[PDB]
Amino acid sequence: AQSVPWGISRVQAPAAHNRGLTGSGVKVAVLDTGISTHPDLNIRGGASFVPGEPSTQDGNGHGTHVAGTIAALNNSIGVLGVAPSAELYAVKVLGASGSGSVSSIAQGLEWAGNNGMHVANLSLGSPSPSATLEQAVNSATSRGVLVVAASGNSGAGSISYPARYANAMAVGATDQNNNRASFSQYGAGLDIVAPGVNVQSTYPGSTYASLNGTSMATPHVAGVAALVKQKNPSWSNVQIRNHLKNTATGLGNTNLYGSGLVNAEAATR
Numbered sequence: 001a002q003s004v005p006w007g008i009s010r011v012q013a014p015a016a017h018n019r020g021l022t023g024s025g026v027k028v029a030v031l032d033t034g035i036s037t038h039p040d041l042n043i044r045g046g047a048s049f050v051p052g053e054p055s056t057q058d059g060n061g062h063g064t065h066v067a068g069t070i071a072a073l074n075n076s077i078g079v080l081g082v083a084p085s086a087e088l089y090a091v092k093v094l095g096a097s098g099s100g101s102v103s104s105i106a107q108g109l110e111w112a113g114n115n116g117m118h119v120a121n122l123s124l125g126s127p128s129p130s131a132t133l134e135q136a137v138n139s140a141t142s143r144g145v146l147v148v149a150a151s152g153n154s155g156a157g158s159i160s161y162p163a164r165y166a167n168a169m170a171v172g173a174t175d176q177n178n179n180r181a182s183f184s185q186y187g188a189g190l191d192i193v194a195p196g197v198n199v200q201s202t203y204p205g206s207t208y209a210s211l212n213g214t215s216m217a218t219p220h221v222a223g224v225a226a227l228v229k230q231k232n233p234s235w236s237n238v239q240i241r242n243h244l245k246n247t248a249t250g251l252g253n254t255n256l257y258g259s260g261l262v263n264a265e266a267a268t269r
């Protein structure tokens with residue numbers, strides 16, 4: 001039996017699937033702890049930038065969970081991703097502790113840009129600004145990648161890096177009431193929000209787990225960006241970003257919510 005997690009229904013991904021849009025032909029790089037093999041995931045390739053780790057296997061769980069919110073297969077098991085036919089690439093930039101360096105994150109972004117990824121999901125943050133990060137987001141954006149990044153989980157009124165930079169689409173987290181989740185960082189630079197509380201998805205060891213975080217909200221927006229790219233193959237990263245903001249359901253003040261809740265039905269109309 002396949003279940004549809006509440007967040008997938010909340011962003012109205014099933015409505016876009018009924019229009020025949022599933023993210024087919026869209027390449028999505030998940031820059032995280034890796035992605036492990038799972039019966040409800042199909043991983044196309046990837047690269048590791050973690051010192052002394054040649055593989056893209058997930059030693060943490062986080063990367064595999066994020067991957068399942070974007071693209072868990074539409075079948076008779078597990079869950080269902082926002083864009084279940086997207087081509088997933090595992091770009092391992094964080095180690096087993098969930099930590100990484102600005103150098104591995106920046107190498108991952110350069111790989112995404114050099115390998116023609118359409119969307120790069122960064123469910124990660126650095127507490128401090130980094131010129132290296134800004135430059136790598138800008139480089140990947142110039143090559144055509146839409147970078148989507150988590151605002152962070154401190155609950156503060158400023159968002160983390162690289163989400164704060166102009167060329168990153170910053171994603172905050174909502175709960176089941178469509179309120180901002182208490183941990184979700186907000187403030188200047190916030191673009192959009194998506195479900196980030198009790199998000200069930202794929203996990204290592206062929207299982208499933210429920211997690212909370214702006215890292216869970218970010219893949220919902222990366223997934224809806226892949227549905228828009230399938231509908232509109234000639235659109236640029238900037239066009240997709242603006243269309244996602246323009247069609248989001250407003251939830252209140254933009255300092256707290258950006259443009260509001262991502263809406264895959266309205267974005268694929």
Ligand SMILES: [Ca+2]
Pocket residue numbers: 002040072073074075076077078079080
């Ligand atoms: Ca499934």
